[PDB]
Amino acid sequence: EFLAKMTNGFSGADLTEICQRACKLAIRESIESEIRRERERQTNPSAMEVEEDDPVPEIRRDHFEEAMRFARRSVSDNDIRKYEMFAQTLQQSRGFGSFRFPS
Amino acid sequence: EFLAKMTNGFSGADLTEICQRACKLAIRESIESEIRRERERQTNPSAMEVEEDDPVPEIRRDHFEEAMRFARRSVSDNDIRKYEMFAQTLQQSRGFGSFRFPS
Amino acid sequence: EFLAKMTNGFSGADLTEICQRACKLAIRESIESEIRRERERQTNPSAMEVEEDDPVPEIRRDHFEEAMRFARRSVSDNDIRKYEMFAQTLQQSRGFGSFRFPS
Amino acid sequence: HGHVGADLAALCSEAALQAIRKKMDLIDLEDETIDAEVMNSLAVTMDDFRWALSQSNPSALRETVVEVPQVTWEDIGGLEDVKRELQELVQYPVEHPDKFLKFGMTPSKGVLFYGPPGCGKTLLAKAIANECQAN
């Protein structure tokens, strides 16, 4: 809900990217963990991995807060202004309005 | 490494030519040697060619220093400036940046 | 001399700026020192300032190495190419060349 | 790089003919009953293969080819941002297919390089194929 009143003029095809961006960032943190989990120096067989790491089982908040910094509105202000000018080029009761019938 | 910090704005397809230029210049020096090696006047059969000439078994430095004088940048400054203007016509976080979440 | 063979196509009005840039950066380091020299906490009158600081009595090398990063060529490649095309639009022995007189 | 197996059989046959042809100055036509000295003391050498390959045998092949490339990552050093992005877009949906279904992000399907002519565009696009061992 905080993402709602922060992204005002974003199109629907744009905030479907920032969740794919935060997904991509969390996969980057997961493979980052799995490239150093097997990189154990003085790898003792004692104290086995019966407790798993499980570093990122879901998207955290700072993944969103980092992926949100690359947000970008696709449509400009000049094209939403173009479609509003097309809505008024369309009629939408282009005329009198608010009349009544004789008794 | 001295060729690195001397050719700054050269494209990758341009310094692949100057090594073909220095190769072509060293082949010119090799066939130059082989056109005068067999051109022996008072050619005595004594003191045979048991020691070979081998004049240019590799590219020397002055082959590079002579071939470098015909270096030429293919792309201009106006086209790298065109692509940077296309990078800013692209979004690349064309917006707010650097926000945070409520506690 | 290392600045000579590093700035190739810079105009004369451009490397008169980068020495004013390194001068401006060294004045920034001097007033930076004088804003913390008088900011002494537990300012004892003992051990007086008979030895001065004198932090930047000249421009150091890293002032140049930091100011050089904001170097910018003013003239483009398209205008030096324009003047060379004006040199060939000019004559400069646009003709025969290399003749001799009868004996 | 562009021959087929029957082309290589023809290449070997032409190298054998070239090695025979270089010995016909002493293998003459007057040698009617042929002596078996050449039949156990002739071996094709390298320049005969080079003659049969370069001077002759036009290859019977033009079409597309499918193999892993071989230009490594140190053929264009640096550009670590582009390399890291291509790793996140190509390396990971091949080398780690299960973790993409942990939280279920669908992968993308390709980027569009753009730049000046001759900055190693193709030489970079082959590099991720060489790193992933992909075709």
mmCIF file of C-alpha atoms in Angstrom, chain A residues 2-3 5-6 61-62 64-66 68-69, chain B residues 96-103:
data_model
loop_
_atom_site.group_PDB
_atom_site.id
_atom_site.type_symbol
_atom_site.label_atom_id
_atom_site.label_comp_id
_atom_site.label_asym_id
_atom_site.label_seq_id
_atom_site.Cartn_x
_atom_site.Cartn_y
_atom_site.Cartn_z
ATOM 1 C CA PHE A 2 2.985 2.272 0.478
ATOM 2 C CA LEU A 3 4.028 1.363 -3.060
ATOM 3 C CA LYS A 5 0.773 6.126 -3.065
ATOM 4 C CA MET A 6 4.436 6.414 -4.062
ATOM 5 C CA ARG A 61 12.330 -5.110 1.871
ATOM 6 C CA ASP A 62 15.721 -3.798 0.816
ATOM 7 C CA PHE A 64 12.472 -3.690 -3.237
ATOM 8 C CA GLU A 65 14.116 -0.539 -1.953
ATOM 9 C CA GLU A 66 17.118 -1.233 -4.196
ATOM 10 C CA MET A 68 12.748 0.660 -6.933
ATOM 11 C CA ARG A 69 15.676 2.997 -7.618
ATOM 12 C CA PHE B 96 13.140 10.192 -8.379
ATOM 13 C CA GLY B 97 15.823 7.893 -6.949
ATOM 14 C CA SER B 98 16.900 7.361 -3.309
ATOM 15 C CA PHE B 99 13.712 6.903 -1.303
ATOM 16 C CA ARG B 100 13.040 4.789 1.782
ATOM 17 C CA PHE B 101 10.205 2.850 3.587
ATOM 18 C CA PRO B 102 8.325 3.918 6.725
ATOM 19 C CA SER B 103 9.359 2.322 9.996
#
